[PDB]
């Protein structure tokens, strides 16, 4: 069945924040479904004859997936989000069984038919779940949230999904409807429903539909259920600037997209829903894609971790080496992003947020221990190494990093230089170094420093033959201990310059320049020692790059001043768009950047042309007959509202 399109209603607006506002016209920017957009009306299953039409369009998740369903029986059950929809990558599974809603994050190996299995039970007369045929695996499960069913119980059902900075948000709302297929033209705010810190990459969306015991049978014939009623709506959210309206109760009564059309742009720039008759300039004639550009120079004062990591010689565990690190910037994700490290476990902090935190003092301790001994290094553990060679506080903060080094720290005769304190009088405290060579007097006999039957040398060394095998192979183990004190911190993570992007008319804020424009290569070379090339004007056509060694041109989005002429919102809905100092042939030059934004190809109407010295005018007819001015357009000729 070919895909179909339907006109999006104004519905889709969700609360951007949990903050409460009353009787306030508040403007916010986020991902949104544009007004009057095209919604792909997936007629998922059609049954006339009992003809199964199994359709599960795996749509690209993109920024935000606006969902709408008219299923009276609520046949649809949850949604599926995943980069690859297999065990290879992490996937999000949402199931809306009646008992509770299941939100479990696992690397599910999804089957070819991703449906919800439910069998009718004769004794209980209940549509209770049979089995989950949607997936086949549950690997590396991370996050689980359980709540009551929200889609469970002629009523329109709407949802918005967004994936931002590893944080998953859901908005929901239900409204009764008497329209068979037309989306009601009513403003329905979508209150926040649940927020999830899933923290995985999601690329494509797939919806889930429950197959009853009729469809559970292998044959195409259905036992007692038909899915012809299945139908829903899908729309893609894009970054948009909105002018929300809050009432006294705080409900979002209405909103206008700054990119919907010139009148809504005038509404946005005037910060009011109702504007009077006249001429007004607008700025948010469309939205800024991607991310605003802010610069920091690439890091120079790196912390000398690699010296500790790549030191030619390491000390034995008993005489473990210690280095203090401060007054530098350190990257840990780079260490995390290395398969050369066999063991990378953190305690008291997440490896992902490691670059986010600051510490006054960071102590790195390294030594050599054989493979099976790496377990004891973890905080709160027990064992000979933990007790007599090195111990960590139970409240330790930091990470333990290890890797095999049989290639380097072993020889044909085996390395005996690496040593472990086998015997000691008492268990070591955390952060305690013992280097005493005094003979261990296990027995009561005072040996006076002479080896005997009950007197043992406290120290013992590995053989480290290369063929002993992993678990006996040397592991160069480095322990990162972070000291968190009420002192001005020194160690801090790196600052990211967002890599580099090109040809996007977005905000440039090179170390806080606070400008707007499109990124293009600059052939002109400004003064090099400046971080950014300085123009005679405050706004600089070309901005030098602190990160790289380059200068990049910038260009504003609206080279023409978007002056919109329209009567009062009470008066009429007609619009008049004037591009000041722009020829009607340069109106297509504007239309290029405008048509980069969707539906502005349709907008500016059909670009019906009337040229004035002040600028080319589109959206009105020139009045040949002389008349008194209605709106001071310019050049002594004005147009008025009429039938």
């Amino acid at each position: 069945l070919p895909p179909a399109y339907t006109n999006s209603f104004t519905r889709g607006v969700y609360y951007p924040d949990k903050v409460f506002r009353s009787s306030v016209l508040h403007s916010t920017q986020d991902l949104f479904l544009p007004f009057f957009s095209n919604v792909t009306w997936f007629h998922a299953i059609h049954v006339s004859n009992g003809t199964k039409r199994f359709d599960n369009p795996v749509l690209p998740f993109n920024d935000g997936v606006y969902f709408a369903s008219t299923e009276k029986s609520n046949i649809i059950r949850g949604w599926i989000f995943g980069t690859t929809l297999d065990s290879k990558t992490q996937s999000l599974l949402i199931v809306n069984n009646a008992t509770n809603v299941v939100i479990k994050v696992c690397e599910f190996q999804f089957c070819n038919d991703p449906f919800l299995g439910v069998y009718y039970h004769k004794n209980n007369k209940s549509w209770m779940e049979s089995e989950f045929r949607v997936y086949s695996s549950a690997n590396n499960c991370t996050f689980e949230y359980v709540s009551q069913p929200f889609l469970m119980d002629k009523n329109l059902r709407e949802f918005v999904f967004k994936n931002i900075d590893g944080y998953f948000k859901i908005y929901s709302k239900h409204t009764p409807i008497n329209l068979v297929r037309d989306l009601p033209q009513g403003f329905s705010a979508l209150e926040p429903l649940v927020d999830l810190p899933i923290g995985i990459n999601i690329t494509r969306f797939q919806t889930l539909l429950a197959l009853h015991r009729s469809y559970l049978t292998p044959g195409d014939s259905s036992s007692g259920w038909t899915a012809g009623a299945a139908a829903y709506y899908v729309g893609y959210l894009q970054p948009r600037t909105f002018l929300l309206k809050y009432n006294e109760n705080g409900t979002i009564t209405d909103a206008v997209d700054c990119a919907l059309d010139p009148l809504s742009e005038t509404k946005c720039t005037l910060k009011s829903f109702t504007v009077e008759k006249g001429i007004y300039q607008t700025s948010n004639f469309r939205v800024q894609p991607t991310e605003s550009i802010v610069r920091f120079p690439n890091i120079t004062n790196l912390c000398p971790f690699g010296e500790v990591f790549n030191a030619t010689r390491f000390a034995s565990v008993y005489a473990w080496n210690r280095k203090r690190i401060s007054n530098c910037v350190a990257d840990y994700s780079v260490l995390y992003n290395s398969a050369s490290f066999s063991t990378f476990k953190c305690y008291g902090v997440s490896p992902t947020k490691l670059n986010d935190l600051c510490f006054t003092n960071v102590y790195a301790d390294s030594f050599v221990i054989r493979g099976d001994e790496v377990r004891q290094i973890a905080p709160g553990q027990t064992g000979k190494i933990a007790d007599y060679n090195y111990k960590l506080p139970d409240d330790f903060t930091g990470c333990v990093i290890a890797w095999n080094s049989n290639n380097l720290d072993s020889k044909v005769g085996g390395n005996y230089n690496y040593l472990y304190r086998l015997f000691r009088k008492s268990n070591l405290k955390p952060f305690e170094r013992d280097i005493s060579t005094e003979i261990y007097q296990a027995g009561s006999t005072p040996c006076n420093g002479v080896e005997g039957f009950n007197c043992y040398f406290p120290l013992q060394s590995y053989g480290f033959q290369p063929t002993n095998g992993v678990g006996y192979q040397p592991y160069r183990v480095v322990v990162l201990s972070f000291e968190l004190l009420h002192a001005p911190a020194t160690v801090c993570g790196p600052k990211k310059s967002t890599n580099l992007v090109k040809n996007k008319c977005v905000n440039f804020n090179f170390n806080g320049l606070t400008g707007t424009g499109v990124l293009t290569e600059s052939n002109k070379k400004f003064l090099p020692f400046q971080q950014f090339g300085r123009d005679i004007a405050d706004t600089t056509d070309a901005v030098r790059d602190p990160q790289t060694l380059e200068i990049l041109d910038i260009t504003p989005c609206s080279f023409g001043g978007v002056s919109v002429i329209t009567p009062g919102t009470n008066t009429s809905n007609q619009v008049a768009v004037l591009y000041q100092d722009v020829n009607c042939t340069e109106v297509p030059v504007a239309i290029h950047a405008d048509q980069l934004t969707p539906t502005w190809r349709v907008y500016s109407t059909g670009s019906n042309v009337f040229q004035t010295r002040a600028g080319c005018l589109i959206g009105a007819e020139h009045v040949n007959n002389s008349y008194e001015c209605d709106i001071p357009i310019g050049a002594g000729i004005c147009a008025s509202y009429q039938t």
Partner: antibody
Framework: QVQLQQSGPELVKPGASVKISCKASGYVFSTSWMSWVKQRPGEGPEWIGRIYPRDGHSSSTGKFKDKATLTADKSSNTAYIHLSSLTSEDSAVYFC???????????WGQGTTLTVSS | DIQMTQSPASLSASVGEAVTITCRLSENVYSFLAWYQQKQGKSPQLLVYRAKTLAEGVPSRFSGSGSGTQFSLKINSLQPEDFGTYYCQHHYGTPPTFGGGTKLEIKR
């Protein structure tokens, strides 16, 4: 021994730009981060950003990225926060607080109430 | 973003009683939370950062506890000056978020 003082409360027309001055004493200005926190009346305060004077670096959240720009003068140990496009929603009380880099705040200035109205 | 939940929202107790205020966070922050006391018209004052670490110049009556999602601020003995509003705030990195606000009233 750690004293933090801010300028008096300011009345500004909506849509304009305002600057708030915070003064620090009794400790090295450069070594310790100085931040800003904005509190709506009858509502919990919110973090704004941080500035670290010796290099002039400033980090802030996207919500106030356009609104707030952090500038710190090492000479007078006085860091000025600049707010622009003032709205009625923006009008609230603002505090400057010393930070040892851990985003927890041991000292706090008396605060300045910002009022936005016609 | 990060969600702050405080229970109870409002609490009242008499002098010398034991009061516990609970904080709940969406994500797991291991130990990087800070407790602040606020009085009307005043600046906030730091009470407990980390979990058990009392701030400088804080009466020994105040105590912090909890790990991960659950964080508890416990007052062993209430005092007349302890009245005010109490906030729980993570400092696990940008952006720090303050709590909704817990009202404490000294009963008499």
């Amino acid at each position: 021994q750690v004293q933090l003082q801010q300028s008096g409360p300011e009345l500004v027309k909506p849509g304009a730009s305002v600057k708030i001055s915070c003064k620090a004493s009794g400790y090295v200005f450069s070594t310790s981060w100085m931040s800003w926190v904005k509190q709506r009346p009858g509502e919990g305060p919110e973090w704004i950003g941080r500035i670290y004077p010796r290099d002039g670096h400033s980090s802030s959240t996207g919500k106030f990225k356009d609104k707030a720009t952090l500038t710190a003068d090492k000479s007078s140990n006085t860091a000025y926060i600049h707010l622009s496009s003032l709205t009625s929603e923006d009008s609230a009380v603002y505090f400057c607080a010393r930070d040892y880099g851990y985003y927890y705040f041991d000292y706090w200035g008396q605060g300045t109430t910002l009022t936005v109205s016609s | 973003d990060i969600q702050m939940t405080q229970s109870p929202a409002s609490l009242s107790a008499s002098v010398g009683e034991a009061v516990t205020i609970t904080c709940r966070l969406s994500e797991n922050v291991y130990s990087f939370l800070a407790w602040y006391q606020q009085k009307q018209g005043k600046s906030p004052q730091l009470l407990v950062y980390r979990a058990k670490t009392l701030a400088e110049g804080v009466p020994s009556r105040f105590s912090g506890s909890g790990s991960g999602t659950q964080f508890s601020l416990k007052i062993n003995s209430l005092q007349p000056e302890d009245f005010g509003t109490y906030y729980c705030q993570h400092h696990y990195g940008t952006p720090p978020t303050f709590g909704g606000g817990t009202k404490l009233e000294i009963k008499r």
